[PDB]
Design a binder for this molecule. Structure first.
Ligand SMILES: Nc1nc2c(ncn2[C@@H]2O[C@H](COP(=O)(O)OP(=O)(O)O)[C@@H](O)[C@H]2O)c(=O)[nH]1
Ligand SMILES: Nc1nc2c(ncn2[C@@H]2O[C@H](COP(=O)(O)OP(=O)(O)O)[C@@H](O)[C@H]2O)c(=O)[nH]1
Ligand code: ALF
Ligand code: ALF
Ligand SMILES: [Mg+2]
Ligand SMILES: [Mg+2]
Ligand code: NA
Ligand code: NA
Lengths: 341, 341
């Protein structure tokens, strides 16, 4: 898939250029759950550049479709800043925050229009993650009275797609039965074919309690199971603790907890990355046919259009962006197919 | 207040015995909130003795209508345990658990049939509380697919009534925007005229965070405000820590917390109890004339019912349970009205 990401990118771009942005339905992974369950924190571990805004209260307010591509040098590009190469990750964070404010148009409200960000790095896996605002029940500040439903609708646009894997995130310090994540995952993926349970904040459970029943997949079983994680507290985020230290603490936590130690090797952030990648690879594998057919269809249709061409014969000027983009689309589709088996 | 409490209690018992509470609208305080928010822990503190089943997972599974009466001696009586008196509160706890299992089983189901309990004590206020199962989002164990709806329907029968104060319980370790309590409270009491917010588990918040904004009534303002409490942990419970020690720990908590010290005098369990009592007293003084009119109407209704039953069962001139049941309501209404001059 890493081999055709280059093409699909040229594809989406040519489509966006003519204002049509195609429904490629490329495999991606979206985090769903209640507000501040720790979703952005789970996704931050796949990048480690601190640009994903985290925090209690409402922070994520727009979907962030983050494409990670393994490359030799590190840089980022936003689809809305075409032509710009970001090398400063602090600037990447500021842009996410400024863009969030610009489109939401409010202090605490949301907007379902996604922020599209691509990050090239020699430290990342090849995949697309979608960070999403957490579900709520009552509005605060300038949020609309139907905020709970706007947020749910926003998530539904992603999770109702067959190609979107679901990271159902639930915090350990709330009974699982209260999980907004599991409720939505069951509704859209009754069979659990694409739901992976993630249990965060295990370090915050009330003394004398534990999530053993949940972690052993017995309370609310999921085919893909549940993986517990322990991410940075607000103190540690403000304190600048890095991922290496947080990962060491998480390992120690699981190795030392009397209720989880027998499960340690299938717990933790590194394990989640391993499993997620495997599930994604598998999904891509069994869903490839559908993608190739989509491409074959778009190609045939485009060929019909292109067949009746002879665009600009005169000198230099006489610009025609539409034709140029149809040609970029045409060529991208063919290269995509030659790679797509 | 004017000690009409015994009269209202006897009246409530008369209707409760035959499941006819839908006909009344008596003053009481009902607790609403998500599962395991600490609702039972809050109510139990009114008595100061351990007697209510508590814990993570679903524990309260039937409504508990708890009549507290100030008296020289301490003991309890259940409406379903005819002629028995309990002075061992652990036996009271076991009875609630047994009577709950008798109707709901031990496989997680609930039932809206109330357990009616009265506790006499020199340490309690004169008022009635209603403990209720916390709201959920996804079924578990042998719970039906619509368990969320069944639980919300059950509490709705209590909180939709005009004379029912609403104790909106939210745990500090979840963003307030996630509050099941506040959502339902705002749905039945939009102007917050009879809603009191309680924030539990302040001792469980993530390091580097605090609930100052909510406790100052700033994050999501409530007409009657918010009061924070710190109840016992599961480990405290297991270690047999009593209520008096929990109270000491709670007082120290607010006085020593840099974020709450300036609000300490308006924080804590005894303050919450003082406030609820004042709010209820205020509510009753205001609703009394209407209560008088409703009881007068019910009296006329019951008299006619007794005359009509006479026709349904001209009888062998003996005595059947139905007439006794009806005369019990009749006398309770008359006696209550005598006090409500
Ligand atoms: N102690 C602890 N804090 C966590 C954990 N995960 C997240 N947090 C904190 O919870 C808050 C919410 O995190 P965030 O990732 O913004 O969740 P999101 O709103 O769901 O994206 C932040 O203050 C994080 O520091 C965890 O596993 N343990
Ligand atoms: N640490 C701590 N634990 C609490 C607090 N309030 C309740 N709990 C615990 O939370 C669990 C649920 O308590 P419970 O009263 O049964 O809540 P209910 O289900 O909502 O009635 C129990 O394990 C309690 O010990 C609190 O303020 N602090
Ligand atoms: F900031 Al959030 F769910 F509360 F991403
Ligand atoms: F046991 Al509960 F709300 F979870 F009373
Ligand atoms: Mg987030
Ligand atoms: Mg309870
Ligand atoms: Na947040
Ligand atoms: Na509970």
């Amino acid at each position: 898939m890493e081999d055709l990401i280059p093409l699909v990118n040229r594809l989406q771009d040519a489509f966006s250029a003519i204002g049509q942005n195609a429904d490629l339905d490329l495999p991606q992974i979206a985090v769903v759950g209640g507000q501040s369950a720790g979703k952005s924190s789970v996704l931050e571990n796949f990048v480690g550049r601190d640009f994903l805004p985290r925090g209690s209260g409402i922070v994520t307010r727009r979907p962030l479709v983050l494409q990670l591509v393994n490359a030799t040098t590190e840089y980022a590009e936003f689809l809305h800043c075409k032509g710009k190469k970001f090398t400063d990750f602090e600037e990447v964070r500021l842009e996410i925050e400024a863009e969030t404010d610009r489109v939401t148009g409010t202090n605490k409200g949301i907007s379902p229009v996604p922020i599209n960000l691509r990050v090239y790095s020699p430290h990342v896996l090849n995949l697309t993650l979608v960070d999403l605002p957490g579900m709520t029940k009552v509005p605060v500040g300038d949020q609309p009275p139907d905020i709970e439903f706007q947020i749910r609708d926003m998530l539904m646009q992603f999770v109702t797609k067959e190609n979107c894997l679901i990271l159902a995130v639930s915090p350990a310090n709330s009974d699982l039965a209260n999980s907004d994540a599991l409720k939505v995952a069951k509704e859209v993926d009754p069979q659990g074919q694409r739901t992976i349970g993630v249990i965060t904040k295990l370090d915050l459970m009330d003394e004398g309690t534990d999530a053993r029943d949940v972690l052993e997949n017995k309370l609310l079983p999921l085919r893909r199971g549940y993986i517990g994680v322990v991410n940075r507290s607000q103190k540690d985020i403000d304190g600048k603790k890095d991922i290496t230290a947080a990962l060491a603490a998480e390992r120690k936590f699981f190795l030392s907890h009397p209720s989880y130690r027998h499960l340690a090797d299938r717990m933790g952030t590194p394990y989640l990355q391993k499993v997620l990648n495997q599930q994604l690879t598998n999904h891509i594998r069994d869903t490839l046919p559908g993608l190739r057919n989509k491409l074959q269809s778009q190609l045939l249709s485009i060929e019909k259009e292109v067949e009746e061409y002879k665009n600009f014969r005169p000198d230099k000027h006489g610009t025609d962006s539409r034709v140029d983009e149809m040609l970029r689309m045409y060529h991208a589709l063919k290269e995509a197919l030659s790679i797509i088996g």
